[PDB]
Amino acid sequence: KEDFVGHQVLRISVADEAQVQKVKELEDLEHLQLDFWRGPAHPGSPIDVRVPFPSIQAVKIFLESHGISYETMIEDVQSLLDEEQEQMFRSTDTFNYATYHTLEEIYDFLDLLVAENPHLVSKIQIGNTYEGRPIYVLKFSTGGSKRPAIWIDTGIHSREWVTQASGVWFAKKITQDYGQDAAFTAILDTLDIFLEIVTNPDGFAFTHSTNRMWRKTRSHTAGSLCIGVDPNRNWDAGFGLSGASSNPCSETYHGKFANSEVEVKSIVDFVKDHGNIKAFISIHSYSQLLMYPYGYKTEPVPDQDELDQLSKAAVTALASLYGTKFNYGSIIKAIYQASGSTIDWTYSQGIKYSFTFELRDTGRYGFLLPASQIIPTAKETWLALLTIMEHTLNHP
Amino acid sequence: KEDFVGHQVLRISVADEAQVQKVKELEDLEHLQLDFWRGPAHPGSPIDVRVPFPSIQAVKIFLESHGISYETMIEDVQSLLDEEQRSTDTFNYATYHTLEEIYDFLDLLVAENPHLVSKIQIGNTYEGRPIYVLKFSTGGSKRPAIWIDTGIHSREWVTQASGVWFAKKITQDYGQDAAFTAILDTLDIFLEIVTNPDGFAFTHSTNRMWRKTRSHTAGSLCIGVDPNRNWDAGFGLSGASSNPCSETYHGKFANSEVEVKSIVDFVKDHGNIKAFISIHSYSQLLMYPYGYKTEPVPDQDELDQLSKAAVTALASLYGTKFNYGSIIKAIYQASGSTIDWTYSQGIKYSFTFELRDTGRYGFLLPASQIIPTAKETWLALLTIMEHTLNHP
Ligand SMILES: CC(C)C[C@H](C(=O)O)[C@H](C)S
Ligand SMILES: CC(C)C[C@H](C(=O)O)[C@H](C)S
Ligand SMILES: [Zn+2]
Ligand SMILES: [Zn+2]
Ligand SMILES: [Zn+2]
């Protein structure tokens, strides 16, 4: 099991391209074993990086020598994990939604939820992962066949544990509110919802068994010691090097070609075979953003005004509960340019209401968010999802 | 019994001094019957005001015709209220209680914990109600102590509800959690849950939005003094109102309000209070002195590092983000407020909290957020109490 005692997470501010390029020099030094949480992008995008203890002085002196400002977001990564492990140690009503679960625990949850709600909920298998694990989607439906549908996925990046944990909560919430809250009942009486809670099962299993900081898939790359592809750079729209890496060791390695990862191709084949997906929402952490296309280019989507207004309503709804502030905009404007990310592809297929979320927080814990924040994160995000779903329903 | 059907809460933005004055001009207008949640202060300080159903048209028209930009924070105040409307083990901490329910709770907690908890009456309110402080102590007499108060402004109901939760928490953790037991083995804790009982009974019986005391003001139709403008530190200087109808009316002399005088007497008679924490809502702020003047406190660096640690601790639980600083820097100039007085008496660890939220609900926070507010606030309180214990 990887440990991280004395590892720090630094947030580096890069004020111009020159400073971006200096941080890219650090990234190129594989011996430092750096783990970028938010990689070099453009000037003014903060660069968040986990630095192993023996690399800390070298990194700090480098940044200081070049006048590049940084702050220490996390002083001791292992303290957060030990805490996480510590608070980690029947029916869906007695399931603990306020802790983090393993892949087996989540998959057991899926079967319990189906067993308890056979007229609403079914489980679909859309593929098997690189390592052979089944990939499962929950389908919530009141009838029809291939009704217009909302697709939601969480955990495409395995280390973003609050997203799988929110997915589990959303699945339970849907079953609680169907037949009970009329406004939500109205959504499901017309639309199906598909929910993929563990979108990268191999990386997820790997975050529990081996390396809590694992992001990518677990595919092997011929003649490289580095494993895995960033599934959020592996989609066939805008694929390439302006916003992803051809280096197998990169956190944003895009693979050899689009849809090389079965976890991505399974969703592509599903969506195309279904043919009537009307909203597609892909959920990540962290940064508190709600985004619409495009990531790969600056040209607005033709539906930009409508999607921007809907984004504004959705973050206002989210903020209603706890005041959590999300910014919104195209991917390229709100966060950075990225090549081959999911909703560029889904929008290109005709799914107008294509959105991607980056949930809590804004870097103090990053993806090591305390379990105690699972439910608040899930509750607020559900209000944003309801906004998108109501719009999908009433304003197609 | 007030209802608020169709009342809105507006958040008014003021860019410069001239604009502040224009808003301050409709603060003067009794007929509008406005209720400022966050009054006119300096420029760049949002003004939050509940404007009544018959007055909404009138004030919307006033603002626009003067170019003051504003946003509508709360659309139907009633909706947030209709939403609202044995032992300490089975007491419901996730709901708001009445005065008598809280006073009954005080007796139940004392009865269940007779060697740790005692009730003390420090005075009576203007209307004659007893004013009670719970003392948590493991012995001695006038050991160094921490003072916490909630509810000095009656409408800030999450504070009294949190105070009830803290009382129970102290009884649960004492003798079980060593870090907290270390606090009470050296220091006493005084906790005043309902610091303004008349105003509290009034928020239940007549008017949910009541803030002040219920004292009658000689030669005025208006009732009550702002107990957090009535302390003898900067009394009557910029940062309070001399208008008896104002939310921030300072009264005729410092300590005119028996609810404030009773605390002042207690503190002076005790002489060993080492930390004093006065809790309010809303705004998500943790502040130290001064509110009445810009001069920093001699202890500013220490207090500011302590505040940073406390807000970091608080945020860990549910992500709630608090800003911190002197009152004057972090919110606005305010005169005659509690911690300027307590700090002037040598009480180094003088802090005032503003709890959830930052305006969606204001003081009409849903009962489902009581326990999360109280839990996260308790982490910040532990930070201050550890510091009082270990670094006098
Ligand atoms: C919309 C995308 C491009 C956001 C981002 C990423 O994949 O880099 C996540 C924060 S991991
Ligand atoms: C520190 C003081 C000025 C606090 C403030 C007030 O009394 O106005 C509360 C937010 S009600
Ligand atoms: Zn991600
Ligand atoms: Zn107050
Ligand atoms: Zn200490």
Which ligand sits closest to the CA of B182?
Answer: 5
Resolution of the structure, angstroms: 1.8
Task: Name the nearest CA neighbour of B297 among B344, B330, B367, B236.
Answer: B344
What's the length of chain A? 396
d(CA B270, CA A15): 55
Q: For domain A93-392, is the CATH number 3.40.630.10?
A: yes
The secondary structure of residue B42, as a DSSP letter, is: S
The answer to whether the CB atoms of A373 and B315 lie below 8 A apart is no
Helix (H, G, I), strand (E, B) or coil at B377: helix
Please list, in sequence order, all residues whose beta carbon lies within 8 angstroms of the beta carbon of residue B356, skipping any fewer than 6 positions away.
A322, B158, B281, B282, B284, B320, B365, B369, B373
Q: What angle do the packed helices A161-177 and A103-116 form, to 10 degrees?
A: 10
Spacing of C-alpha A314 from chain mean position:
18
Measured in Å, residue B364 CA sits from the centre of ligand 4 at 13
The domains of chain B are located at: 1-85, 89-388
Helices (H), A210-354: 262-274, 304-322, 331-334, 342-348
Task: State the catalytic residue, choosing from A196, A251, A263, A358.
Answer: A358
Measured by CA distance, the residue closest to atom 7 of ligand 1 is: A232
B362: chain A residues, CB-CB within 8 Å: none
The answer to whether the CB atoms of A370 and B315 lie below 8 A apart is no
Q: Residue A136: helix, strand or coil by DSSP? A: strand
Q: Pick B360's closest partner by Cβ from A323, A373, A377.
A: A323
Q: How many angstroms separate the CA atoms of B263 and A102, rounded? A: 53
From B149, B158, B225, B337, the mutation candidate for ligand 2 (largest count of ligand atoms within 8 A of CB) is B337
Beta carbon of A334 within 6 Å of any ligand 1 atom:
no
Cβ distance B176 to B221 under 8 Å? no
**Distance between CA atoms of A99 and B265, rounded to whole angstroms?**
48
Q: Is A83 tagged catalytic?
A: no
The encoded tokens of residue B144 equal: 């160094």
Alpha-carbon gap, residue A316 to A326, rounded angstroms: 8
Q: How many whole angstroms separate alpha carbon A71 and alpha carbon A148?
A: 47
| Residue identifier of the C-alpha nearest atom 11 of ligand 2 | B280
Ligand 1 lined by A291 (C-beta under 6 Å): yes
Any atom of ligand 2 within 6 Å of the Cβ of B337: yes
d(CA B261, CA B257): 6
Find the Cα–Cα–Cα–Cα dihedral A21, A25, A30, A35, rounded to 10°: -50
Whether B291 is in the pocket of ligand 2, judged by its Cβ within 6 Å, is yes
Residue A289, strand partner residues? A327, A358
Name the amino acid, one letter, at B81.
Answer: L
Is 3.90.1150.10 the CATH number for B89-388?
no
Query: From CA B324, how far away is CA B315, in angstroms rounded?
Result: 13
Q: Which CATH number fits domain A1-88: 3.40.50.720, 3.30.70.340, 3.40.640.10, 3.30.360.10?
A: 3.30.70.340
Residue A71's φ and ψ, nearest 5 degrees, are -130, 160
Q: Solved by what technique?
A: X-ray
Q: At what angle do helices A374-394 and A304-322 cross, to 10 degrees?
A: 140
> CA–CA separation, A12 vs A25, rounded Å?
14
| Count of C-beta atoms within a 10 Å radius of residue A33 | 12
Query: H or E stretch including B164?
Result: helix B157-173
d(CA B250, CA B336): 7
Cα A306 off chain centre by? 24
CATH class of the region B1-85: alpha beta
What is the phi-psi region of residue A143: left when phi exceeds 0, alpha when psi lies from -120 to 50, beta otherwise?
Answer: left
Collapsing DSSP to helix, strand or coil, A65 comes out as helix
| Strand-pair partners of B132 | B121
The number of angstroms, rounded, from the C-alpha of A298 to the middle of its chain's C-alpha atoms is 22
